[PDB]
Structures are given as structure tokens and as C-alpha cells.
């Protein structure tokens, strides 16, 4: 694996929109979209966050991530996690987790990244642990259907 990172383009959206495979899997990472995910829902969300970056292996955009609150000198919160379906469990989303975590220091100067996620993503809950993050607390949330979920707030000092 020999990943690289940029900033993400226009050119990228159709690839990363294709990247959540079912009405879940675009709530875990992206819950105010609606399904089907398209690339005008993308760019909404890139153009009222910051950060959007891509990782890139073998001339491959194989996965994307922002920020969704940012505050210099404190926290950013890392979201819009999504990792190309051929390429998961490869160290993708770990991967970007690491380069957004020296943006989060160098550009906001954040002394910590919060991470939210939900309960029925166990594969993101056991990364985000291996990673150093922590659980702080646990909100309600509510789904599609409208059955509620609870989101596990999560953070980790940055060094
Ligand atoms: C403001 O916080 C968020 N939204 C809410 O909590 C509001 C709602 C949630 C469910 C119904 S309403 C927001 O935006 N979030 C994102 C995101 O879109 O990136 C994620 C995805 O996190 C990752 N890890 O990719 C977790 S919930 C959190």
C-alpha cells in the first residue's frame, strides 16, 4: 500500500459518491443525506465544510474525509468517512485518519479530533479505538425510519 492525499476536486465527487453501498452505510458516515447518494449532496456538504481531502493509491481515489465543526486552537470533528467498497480493511480510512489529524494540529492548531459514530457501526468503532480514541459520551439519534440509534461520541488528544 503506497497512499497519497490532496485536496479533493470536482473531478473526484462521481468516484467518492459512488463509495456508500446501501441506505447504512450513507447514514453512518453522511446522516443527512438521502438515498440514493448523489454527487449534488456531496458537494453540498464539501462546500459548507473544510478539509475535504482524498487518498489515493495506484491512481485510485479510494477514500475521502471532512471536517464538520472546526475551532482553532481546540477541536476539529472528522466525518464524511467513506472508503471505496474494493478497498476496504486495507488501512484506507486509518490512513486518512492519521493525515487528517496532522491538519487538525497544523492548520486549526486543534489540541484534540472528535469523532462521532453510530452504534451499528462496529467496524468504525473498533478502528476509531485502535486509533486512540475514546468514548465520552452517547446521544440519541434517529434514523430514516425513524427508529432511534445512539451516536458514540468519541475524541482523542492530538500530539
Ligand atoms: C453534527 O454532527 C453530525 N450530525 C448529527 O449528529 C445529526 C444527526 C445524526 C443523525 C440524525 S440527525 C454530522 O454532521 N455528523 C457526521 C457527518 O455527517 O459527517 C457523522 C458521520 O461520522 C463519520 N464518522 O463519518 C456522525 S453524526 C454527526
Known amino acids: 500500500m503506497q497512499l497519497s492525499h490532496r485536496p479533493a476536486e470536482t473531478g473526484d465527487l462521481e468516484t467518492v459518491a459512488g463509495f456508500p453501498q446501501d441506505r447504512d452505510e450513507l447514514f453512518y458516515c453522511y446522516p443527512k443525506a438521502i438515498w440514493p447518494f448523489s454527487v449534488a449532496q456531496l ?22 474525509a471532512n471536517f464538520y465543526q472546526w475551532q482553532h486552537g481546540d477541536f476539529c470533528a472528522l466525518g464524511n468517512m467513506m472508503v471505496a467498497p474494493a478497498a476496504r480493511g486495507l488501512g484506507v480510512a486509518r490512513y486518512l485518519i492519521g ?6 494540529r497544523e492548520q486549526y492548531k486543534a489540541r484534540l479530533m472528535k469523532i462521532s459514530c453510530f ?11 485502535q486509533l486512540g480514541y475514546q468514548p465520552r459520551a452517547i446521544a440519541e439519534r434517529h434514523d430514516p425510519d425513524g427508529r432511534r440509534v445512539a451516536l458514540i461520541q468519541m475524541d482523542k488528544p492530538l500530539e
Do not use: P
Request: glycine share 10%.
Open 43 to 64: 458537494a453540498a456538504a464539501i462546500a459548507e465544510r473544510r478539509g475535504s481531502t482524498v487518498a489515493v493509491h495506484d491512481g485510485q481515489v479510494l477514500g475521502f
Open 99 to 104: 493525515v487528517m489529524e496532522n491538519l487538525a
Open 119 to 129: 452504534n451499528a457501526n462496529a467496524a468504525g468503532l473498533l478502528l476509531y479505538t
